[PDB]
């Protein structure tokens, strides 16, 4: 014969932590703490990421013919790679700021490119021919596709210069590599000089990177190397080389305007058109709930990796029901 | 809690309503059941959403990049790089934490005054022509029906 | 939103108020003269005073150039910049973006814990000389003036 | 406090708990001095520890040294290095002042409710059976001896 | 009779917004964000600016023929430049590694000028003048006035040493460029040899230039580059100079002191006499507030910037008249 | 027959500051930040530390033959020093990234000294003998412990080459030096062939380096000069040397085993055999603590720094005594 007052019990058992009382059932909690992911690699807002294959950053634009598949594409908000990659530095050695470019071939907006330097009709006088079996294409040892190489031309090598003049209103990256053999018979047979001379210009920009020889060790085939370098220019600058050989000249030079510098993820996850707005080196994530956890490392506007345990926040009271 | 109510005096919740959050019941004649309430419910809901989803919507961000891959020569740099990551990560980390728990404090308290409102509510009008007890429910000299047991929940009551 | 009384039990405040944010009027024999106890009124201050400038001037720093100027190799580090430079931007903006919510929610849950403090205060002095109706106004069967309500603004009485 | 009683209802600060500070009791008369539930005090190691262990080893970092090295033409980094540094420094400095200025209140409030509702229980049955003294004091008119203390503690009293 | 207790309640409009409830009106209220900047840009912590105008940072220090306004000034807590105004690099060339010798003069202590070494009479068997490229100021074109140039005299090019010892307790900056001729036949003209023999040394600082030589860009009648370099001369420590040819070497130099950094600011803001406690490009701060709305770019002790909109908190009361 | 009920007030005048008031009287307060450095070096994540007394790095893996301390040391978590050092390097010269390797040699499982290639024969065609007076040992000369002195030999300096294969499976410390010659005489007294290059190979990346002859300034005993170089060998490669003069190889090569980069610490504190979880250049804490206010710069997994007073938390209620 009364009249009560009295609160929700619901049926469901969820714990939550407070700084007073840890660990009690609520009617309502939203889990806010992030511990889910996609598990799959998905396009970053609007654009996709760079589908590779096998080869590398390196072997995309060093130009190895086993991965004779990257070409065509024109825009991606980041790459991809395995930790599996062959292809790279088709014959052994160095690149020049290699994690540099990583920077400035992640922001990608607009692709096109053209045969700065061709292997027919641009140098007539030298050989325009090049084959290593550290470059090979099933069963023939072909060259790169963006990378051309000079040895001398019956018996001499004359001189030479090559003073290219940009006008494509947007910036342009170029190739190249400077040679350097073990033996001093395969280094005077090739290139028939003693002391030769390599000559870069740019306004700024300028090396005289000497070919050096010694007993380089064997990355299988080839005992000695080829080191590969680059430089920028935008519209109104000058790249001029005056060379007396020892040089993978620049061949296809890669033209891209970009402003910022994303990044590029390197994973395995398989390639969906799903539209993500964050990615991390095992799927994608959301950004609703601002705090998120699964990988350090993430590309994009995200919710901010976290150590917690649980974040599960209250929206409820305490429970205690049946009848 | 802080209050002798949500735990303490009230003891247990219902297994009841499905809508409100707040409530009460009664036994006269007919009913024996929990009339919801709105105005406890889409104000104490209506601010909660405000919250979390203010602690949800505000923060923002822009384009940023996070991976730099260095290398063997520039080491210094690679613990700048790690050096900054899990510095924010350490406060992401223990705010996100912090704020949480003791946030927490709040939703609980924000029920243990607000239905403390409740069983003051009844309190504040009519008085004692009933009897005081602890459990949070009152008994009525003048019994009330289904009209004016619907008269509780807006407090519209004759006399004290 | 809480304690009953700020903007639910008392439904408006006084534009006649001056001398301070809470106290009492009178509806007494005489005259009319809007008072305020300054004391609680001087003491509340107080502490958003300490509140205020606490927020402020705990606050430091130590001379910092945030320009850094980066060429066309440095690209790498130059956006690596970006990263501190954003990270410490969303952690600030984040911070201070919930400290200002969550304090102005604790100042008026505080100003209806000293109105209230201040009714329940009155409500422990007269006892029983008194009746209650809701707006912190205390109907007497008791018939008084001045130095009586003077009694009641400095916590003394004859009798409860 | 926040709710107003430790310094707001009961204007004192008496000799007893050490430790538990939050455990029921009402006093009734078998002497002087009150006692713990011995759960909600309990609530004292949860409450107050876990506050504390929260804001203590919830807390983990990495391993990391801020120092650097740098060289003459290096004046770029080292300026972007110490920024950092600065930066974070800054950071947890105003947020750790703020947690020990907020939290503190907080629970020298946490102390303020809980030991409150010791008195909202008596009057839950005592009420009028015990008349009114502003000290935080009841006086019950009826006589018990030295064995009442142990009995609305407990919650169960005879005539309300 | 009755007695009844209530509230504070204004005529104000100014809201502002809580966790559970937003738009709440309010009586007293305080603006924990500074979004007002005075649009001037003066004084930090007493120190004055670097004033330059439409001169720069290359020229100030060079001696470019517009940067004669700059003689006597004390010293600076930032610089003072234009983001606009193109006088940079005179007759071209790559400036050092400048930016970060922006960084290192950014905030310098005692700052006085003086001749390094005499253009006149304090080289025996070289040469003077040579003044001639499209750098002028008044109606003539001159050389720079803190570098000297020496060309050939009549016969012979000698090669050489010299130095400048560090007795001083405060340390020196000395800059040196080399000369790239776009012409092969210029060098001759002026220079003599075939090769380069340009040489610096400190003792820790070692680097051999040489004038890797071909045709270049043309600006204002001048093609070819001068590679301006620096460096700071910590006590004892004595800079080595061996030119066959093109080096122009040091003719004033600068005694400093210096080991904190600072800044420049890219705003065309007006120069007035104050103080402040910070600086942005939009205008001067005042640490006063723990957040600041303008800019993300600041100087000194500044509040830490903020994106955000809304940061005023509430003195005063949830409020309403009944009237 | 009354009912006073109340709350605790112990002996304790501690005090504390809130946000709604100050110096607020506790009854049981607890300090939340470690101001306590045991102004003592210690052991650090299990592992003692190293020791080198006066010698800063150069005078170890050099070894600078002015402190004999060093014979055999197994491996540390960081590295100690002095800020005093005297004698740390021997013969003058300019120490190439002299803070990267400092980086590098922080954190490491495991060292080695090894003859590289064995003083013993490794070298005929070369005369050693070489010795300075920069750094003799109590009386008659030496130089240093892990290099020599590939002087020219009798009156010739012919051409040569040696290697070392990556052996020791993990990786090895590969430096090696480069000659400078005070006197024109004194360069063909030693090295005989003049102008002559000096090369040093890895499996990429030849740097090419050039002596300069240098009548450089004096400071500590025949000042030509000499410049150290240094690389980590991994697995997977090999070490090639050439030389028609100018070289300096080492006699003692150090194998090594790492991955996480610590620190540098410079500390004149006693050293001992605690266990402590983070160390500073003040000395060791107790890492339970959050937030520590001991020294910013801090080695080990440590408290967050804050310049803070204080951090006095509250466990209990207010104190109101008078009983």
Redesign the interface.
Same mark, same amino acid.
């Given at each position: 014969d009364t009249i009560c007052i009295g609160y929700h019990a619901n049926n469901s058992t969820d714990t939550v932590d407070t700084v007073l009382e840890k660990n009690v059932t609520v009617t309502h909690s939203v889990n806010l703490l992030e511990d889910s992911h996609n598990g799959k690699l998905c396009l970053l807002k609007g654009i996709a990421p760079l589908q590779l294959g096998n080869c590398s950053v390196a072997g995309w634009i060093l130009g190895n013919p086993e991965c004779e598949l990257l070409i065509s594409k024109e825009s991606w908000s980041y790459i991809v790679e395995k930790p599996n990659p062959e292809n790279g530095t088709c014959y052994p050695g160095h690149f020049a700021d290699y994690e540099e470019l990583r920077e400035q071939l992640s922001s990608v907006s607009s692709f096109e490119r053209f045969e700065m330097f061709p292997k027919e009709s641009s140098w007539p006088n030298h050989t325009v021919t090049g084959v290593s079996a550290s470059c090979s294409h099933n069963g023939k040892s072909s060259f790169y596709k963006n990378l051309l190489w000079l040895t001398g031309k019956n018996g001499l090598y004359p001189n030479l210069s090559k003073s290219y003049a940009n006008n494509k209103e947007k910036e342009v990256l170029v190739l190249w590599g400077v040679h350097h053999p073990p033996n001093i018979g395969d280094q005077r047979a090739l290139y028939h000089t003693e002391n030769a001379y390599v000559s870069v210009v740019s306004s700024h920009y300028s090396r005289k990177f000497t070919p050096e020889i010694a007993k380089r060790p064997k990355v299988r085939d080839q005992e000695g190397r080829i080191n590969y370098y680059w430089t920028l220019l935008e519209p109104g600058d000058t790249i001029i080389f005056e060379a007396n050989g020892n040089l993978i000249a620049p061949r296809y030079a890669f033209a891209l305007s970009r402003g910022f510098g994303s990044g590029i993820i390197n994973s395995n996850a398989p390639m969906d058109e799903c539209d993500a707005k964050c990615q991390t080196p095992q799927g994608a994530i959301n950004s609703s709930l601002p705090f998120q956890n699964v990988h350090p490392v993430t590309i994009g506007e995200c919710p901010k990796y976290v150590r917690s345990a649980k974040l599960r926040m209250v929206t409820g009271l305490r429970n205690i029901p049946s009848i | 809690g802080?209050?002798?109510a949500?735990?303490? $005096?009230?003891?247990?919740?219902?297994?009841?309503?499905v809508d &409100?959050? @707040?409530? @009460?019941?009664?036994?006269?004649e007919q009913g024996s059941g929990?009339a919801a309430d709105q105005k406890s419910t889409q104000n104490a809901i209506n &601010?909660?959403t405000?919250? /979390?989803n203010? /602690?949800?919507e505000?923060?923002?961000?822009?384009?940023?990049? /996070?991976?730099?891959? $260095?290398?063997?020569?520039?080491?210094?740099?690679?613990? %700048?790089?790690?050096?900054?990551?899990?510095?924010?990560?350490?406060?992401?980390?223990?705010?996100?934490?912090?704020?949480?728990? %003791?946030?927490?404090?709040?939703?609980?308290d924000?029920?243990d005054?607000?239905?403390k409102?409740? @069983?003051?509510?009844?309190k504040?009008?009519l008085?004692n022509n009933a009897?005081?007890?602890?459990? &949070?429910? $009152?008994?009525?000299y003048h019994?009330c029906n289904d009209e004016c047991?619907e008269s /509780?929940k807006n407090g519209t009551y004759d006399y004290?």
């Open positions: - | 802080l209050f002798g949500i735990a303490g $005096f009230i003891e247990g919740g219902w297994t009841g309503m &409100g959050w @707040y409530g @009460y019941h009664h036994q006269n929990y &601010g909660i405000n919250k /979390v203010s /602690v949800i505000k923060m923002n961000t822009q384009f940023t990049a /996070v991976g730099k891959e $260095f290398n063997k020569l520039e080491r210094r740099m690679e613990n %700048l790089n790690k050096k900054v990551d899990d510095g924010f990560i350490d406060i992401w980390t223990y705010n996100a934490e912090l704020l949480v728990l %003791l946030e927490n404090e709040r939703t609980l924000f029920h005054s607000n239905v409102n409740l @069983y003051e509510k009844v504040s009008q008085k009897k005081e007890i602890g459990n &949070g429910c $009152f008994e009525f019994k047991m /509780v004290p």
